[PDB]
Ligand binder design. Structure first.
Ligand SMILES: O=C(O)CNC(=O)C(=O)O
Ligand SMILES: [Mg+2]
Ligand code: NI
Ligand SMILES: [Zn+2]
Length: 331
């Protein structure tokens, strides 16, 4: 079995190997990459997402989210407080202000220490989940706006035609902006490209150990757990690496830099934070190997997690028994 310790693997495809996305994902998996839950892909040196980032300031962040924490430094929840719209130019200026900028630090490890020590005492503003793309339409390889759709994958594997579309989303981050512990909707893959700016640190639990994370989370967030059998779908819970180590949860960590892709694999729990002003683009995707995970994915039926139009059909076809109860939560 390849990669039995479930280490995060880093790939360096040639421009020739960068031509066929599906085939490269399948290659990564042949090397055991999926066992970690997360892989890094460094694009060939000849590749570019677009020519420059000089003209992005007039993108609108219609609902910036202020991430307010509660709890203790290692174990906290965050809620998202809606703020007034601002442009990317305005947001970048805010990220760089004295109140929100990245503090002096030695290296990534020192900054990680400062994040976990100090995250809860600040409320950074996140521009999340903005429909759109920063890939040039002439970028042919690994253009997240041109991937095959999850609906076409389900049709090709299962023969059923369903409604829904699949488009990318932009994330504008600042120091301390945080992604809580989660798997993707319907335990899909995700791909994330860091277009510009400061790095993003990731933590991930191997898929084969996801239930160990879930068990800890139910112990650490006992009221949330009673309210909903899949509360990590709410994307509000944070658990530090120190706490995971104290509780013997297997995990790994890696820092993504501008110009690098990360791939999350089905049922790979992940969480992380941004180092400073940045812009990432991400999209969910599927492969044949996803199907069985989609069939077994937990669902939030308490009504908090409130998810896309396209998830309907996935639950309807892959999880017909759940459908009824899940749609009662979604309506
Ligand atoms: O970039 C972020 O804030 C979080 N991204 C993801 O969880 C992802 O790409 O799966
Ligand atoms: Mg613009
Ligand atoms: Ni994710
Ligand atoms: Zn729920």
């Amino acid at each position: 079995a390849q990669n039995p310790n479930c280490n995060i693997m880093i790939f360096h495809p040639t421009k020739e190997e960068f031509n066929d996305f599906d085939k490269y994902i399948a290659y990564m998996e042949s090397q055991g990459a999926h066992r970690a839950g997360l892989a890094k892909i460094i694009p060939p040196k000849e590749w570019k997402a677009r020519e420059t980032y000089d003209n992005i300031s007039e993108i609108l962040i219609a609902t910036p989210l202020q991430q307010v924490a509660s709890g203790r430094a290692g174990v906290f929840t965050q809620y998202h407080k809606k703020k007034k719209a601002m442009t990317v130019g305005e947001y970048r200026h805010l990220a760089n202000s004295k109140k929100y900028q990245t503090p002096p630090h030695q290296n990534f490890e020192d900054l990680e220490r400062k994040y976990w020590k100090n995250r809860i005492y600040n409320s950074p503003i996140y521009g999340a989940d903005i429909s759109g793309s920063l890939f040039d339409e002439n970028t042919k390889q690994w253009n997240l706006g041109h991937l095959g759709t999850i609906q076409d994958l389900l049709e090709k594997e299962c023969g059923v035609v369903i409604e829904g579309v699949n488009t990318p989303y932009l994330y504008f981050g600042m120091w301390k902006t945080t992604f809580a512990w989660h798997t993707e909707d319907m335990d899909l893959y995700s791909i994330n490209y860091l277009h510009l700016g400061e790095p993003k640190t990731w933590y991930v639990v191997p898929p084969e150990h996801g239930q160990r994370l879930e068990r800890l989370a139910r112990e650490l967030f006992p009221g949330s757990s009673r309210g909903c059998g899949a509360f990590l779908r709410h994307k509000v819970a944070l658990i530090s690496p120190t706490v995971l180590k104290e509780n013997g949860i297997p995990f790994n960590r890696i820092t993504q830099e501008a110009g690098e892709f990360m791939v999350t694999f089905p049922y790979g729990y992940h969480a992380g934070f941004n180092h400073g002003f940045n812009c990432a683009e991400a999209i969910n995707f599927a492969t044949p190997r996803w199907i069985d995970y989609g069939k077994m994915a937990s669902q939030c039926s308490c009504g908090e997690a409130r998810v896309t139009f396209s998830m309907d059909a996935f639950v309807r076809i892959l999880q017909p028994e759940r459908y009824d109860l899940w749609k009662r939560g979604q309506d």
